[PDB]
Structure formats: C-alpha cells, structure tokens
Design a binder for these strands. Structure first.
Length: 73
DNA sequence: GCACAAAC
DNA sequence: GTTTGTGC
C-alpha cells in the first residue's frame, strides 16, 4: 500500500529551522511559525539551501529508484 | 486534487 | 489549528 517516504525537503527546515524559532520563541500562541515560514519561501535563505539540499538529493534518488512505477493511490 | 510525514 | 514538497 503506502511506500515509505523520508522527511520532505520542507519538513527538513522544520527540523533545524524551527529549532531556531523554539529558542527565542518556545511559546508561540497561534500557528504563526506556519505562515512565517511561507514568508521565508518567497525569500529562501541560501545559507540554509545549499547545506542540506545536497543530501536531500540522494535520499529521494535511492527510494525513488526502488519504486519507479509505484504511485500514490 | 488525492496520500504521506514532523513539530509547535 | 495549519503549513509545504513530491508524483501523474
């Protein structure tokens, strides 16, 4: 049925990026950290792209090559 | 448009 | 309460 899927390049930010928001703002009332990241997307910081994108490339490549024609259902 | 993952 | 990326 469902194939396994590693973290998405988007949740990757969540992992480390969010840790930054948790330091100075460990108490967010509403879901602001959500619409806030949207602002970062219209202005992606290269300091965060190049670093983890190189790895995220092969993660997808391996599992992808194991399920070529297998698609969501 | 549908299906999945994580954490505040 | 919610965001987004990937594939057709």
């Amino acid at each position: 049925d469902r194939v396994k899927r590693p973290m998405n390049a988007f949740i990757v930010w969540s992992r480390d990026q969010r840790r930054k928001m948790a330091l100075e703002n460990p108490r967010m009332r509403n879901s602001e950290i959500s619409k806030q990241l949207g602002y970062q997307w219209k202005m992606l910081t290269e300091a965060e792209k190049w670093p983890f994108f190189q790895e995220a490339q092969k993660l997808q490549a391996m599992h992808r090559e194991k399920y070529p024609n297998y698609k969501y259902r």
